[PDB]
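Teaching note: in complex prediction, the entire set of molecules is handled at once rather than each chain in isolation. The prompt given to students was simply: 'Predict the structure of this complex.' The entities are:
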Amino acid sequence: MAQVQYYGTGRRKSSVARVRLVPGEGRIVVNNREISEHIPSAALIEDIKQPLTLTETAGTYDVLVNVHGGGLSGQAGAIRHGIARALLEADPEYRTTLKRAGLLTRDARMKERKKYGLKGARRAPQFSKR
Amino acid sequence: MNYNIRGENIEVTPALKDHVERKIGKLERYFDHSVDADVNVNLKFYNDKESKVEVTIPMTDLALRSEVHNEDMYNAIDLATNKLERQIRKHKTKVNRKFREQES
Amino acid sequence: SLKKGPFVDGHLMTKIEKLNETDKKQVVKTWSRRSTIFPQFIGHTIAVYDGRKHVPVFISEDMVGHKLGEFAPTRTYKGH
Amino acid sequence: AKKSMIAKQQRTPKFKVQEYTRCERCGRPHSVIRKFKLCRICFRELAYKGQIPGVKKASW
Amino acid sequence: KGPVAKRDVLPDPIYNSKLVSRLINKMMIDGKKGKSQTILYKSFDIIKERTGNDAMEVFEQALKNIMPVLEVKARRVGGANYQVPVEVRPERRTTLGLRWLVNYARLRGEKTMEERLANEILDAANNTGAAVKKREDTHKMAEANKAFAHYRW
Amino acid sequence: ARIAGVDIPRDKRVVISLTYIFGIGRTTAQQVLKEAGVSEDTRVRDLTEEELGKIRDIIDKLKVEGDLRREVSLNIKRLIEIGSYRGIRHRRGLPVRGQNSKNNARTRKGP
Amino acid sequence: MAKQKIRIRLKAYDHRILDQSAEKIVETAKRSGASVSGPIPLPTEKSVYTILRAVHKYKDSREQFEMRTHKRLIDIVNPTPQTVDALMRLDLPSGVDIEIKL
RNA sequence: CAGUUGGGCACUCUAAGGUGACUGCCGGUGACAAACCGGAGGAAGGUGGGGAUGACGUCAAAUCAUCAUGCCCCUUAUGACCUGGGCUACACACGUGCUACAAUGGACAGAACAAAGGGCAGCGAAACCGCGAGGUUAAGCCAAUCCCACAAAUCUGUUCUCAGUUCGGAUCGCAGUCUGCAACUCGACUGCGUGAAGCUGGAAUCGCUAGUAAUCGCGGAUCAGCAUGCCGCGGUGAAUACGU
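The expected output is the structure of the full assembly:
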């Protein structure tokens, strides 16, 4: 019923967020917790706020992001990826420069499963020197 | 750390332990100083008269060992030591090379 | 055991009720190893299974709750 | 001692905490699978020949 | 295989620092980047508030007096080689300065490694000390053999 | 010294001060010292001329240095004299409380 | 609200018996009244359990057989008591689990 | 109070069919061909990431003890049954890991984030009891519903302040719980106490190309009990590759 704004659900390392950005003033506090309420502080919140700071930098409309999954970079990075893609659904011509300033592709860097006889999927087994 | 010796199907005779131990005392009679050398030896003449020996000595920063067969079972120890001869002289020479030269 | 309780040998409980019942019997084999000494089963000799043959153990008064199979020696020492 | 070992392991246990698991096709001790009902060698060979659905393997 | 380069980091928390963003990339140890961000921001307030001056000028003068030029690249024909003179490249410049300032300054021994590390960078701001002493150290070892191993590489 | 214990703390933490004597430790110092109510408090040496004696009554009612060494004497010496299965490893040299004998052996044997 | 809807959930060894057998299981839901719901897909759980893939040695060289078993569900809407009692005429598949859960 | 509940199937998610990436296209380089450098576009670019898949042959490599099998040998015992013991011993050398030596730390208080698997001979909610480990009864769950379950590293305040200590944790004592026919040889966990040695480890040696190393926790196969191993699962999130 509100203004036609972003709702783009995208994942990053098993944390898909649902950013719902309405016509607003710059309020970014998703899931009832603020940016200083969900995970403070920590100056990586600027990194989780940069993609809204890139689509002409910036609106700023509202921000309502339901992010559940992963961890700090999971919920935060999924929030910025979701508001980045659905934020590409905010302005239709925002993908020209916004597609060239990163802001997409949902890197998917999750854990590799270790083989039968490996340490941590990168840790080698052992060495019997001598 | 030096000179533990064990052997299947046979005794751990000290006239075999000092017999292998003096002869393996040639290399550390000759080299600088190591702490190393575990030895394995067994077999008999159940079939085709054999005595496998296999003596490992991984001390000089990269391993070296050998292996031989015989029936005589003392005369394969000599044929383990002089096998280790070239492996321990070619560990030191090959590396002790002075072909170094710059602009000559 | 935690609460109910100290687990007697049973066969050693029958020999303890009998020989500790009267006449103060002399030490023989007692092949059990489970429970400790008892309140009333003191004094006697347990020649318990040391693995090969028995071993005359005292039914003392210091090891009140200690294991009657604990007094014997298990593995042949010493030693080097 | 396969006959007395596996046959005694088929009998009734002494105490209630005496019943130890046995081997399914070959009566081996040591890690017969309790959910597939077979040994390690039995689960490997009988599972690769066709025993229940299914294969096996190589996800994750 | 060729030169396969690496990626950099984004601008810092306070404020828009990039080379100091690499300073936070070296600032942590054992993965937990929050403690490194806290100790690094504590060095920023400790060196920018105390010792009254700016921040990017202070770090630009510390690493600007920390980023070396020459370095020792080993070689020989075999035994008894010659430590050749091998000058730094740019990213090797900032990397070597981060190594000297970090590994020297965090091993000082003050009340904290954060405030004491800021004291090590502040003593490095005087063009000498631990990190500047290391830049003079490698800067002095090279050019000691700068007359023989210079034209070999 | 001190007014509460024998060889008590001086200019040190109150919970660690109750954690000084051979028997007075951290948990029980927080417990009975928590009944006295210090919490360090005052963190060096100043509890009270009537509070430290409160550690003489509340601090004096428990034990025990010679009673801990005496209970240990009746344990390694009690079972060291009344048997035993804890004696042969209680003084025999080998691992008594459970370990591998080819193990690290930093209780009795060592290297 | 509604009624307690009659729908038998399917369990299968592979995934094609629940798919096709769920298809003809919707063929039982076309008749008998109406309102046969579509393919509510189940979680599709698996089990991964590996054994030592050697005879005696080779403790690192293991092997991991893993066999998953999950199938979809179907819950009909309109009651149709004649088709509901007529659901006992189940012909397929060979490996499939039907259980009228309502 | 609670997606809990009328409602809703937009989003997320669930497993079937497909689609999508194949040097496809453009600029070139190149003996035109092969390939190779660069770019757009796209979620993804030059075998996307990972797994499964291991050529004839070598080592008379490993396995007659998972199983089967040629010969030799035993058989009123090298066979069979039972109790206790041992496989866990201990001057000593190694092998692989855990936990530490500490302020980017230690103790507390509050808050926040997962994924995965198992659970009927089972998981066990809440309630009370016990510091405690756990006990009692008992709703619910044959399980995308219910339980295991609370994640932990991390963020915000008090405080310890450089010392074998308010670090670390063995050893060992007393005192309890749970499991079992029974925890003394020989299960773990908890309480109080105790507080070794360690202040980043020699010559030498190792694994590691990014969601990687490293690090913080969770689940499971065995299994009555018994993980610092093994197999998976997610969290924090690096540096470098000059060149042969």
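Point out the following to students. Chains G and E do not touch (no CB pair under 8 Å). The two ends of chain G are 16 Å apart (CA to CA).
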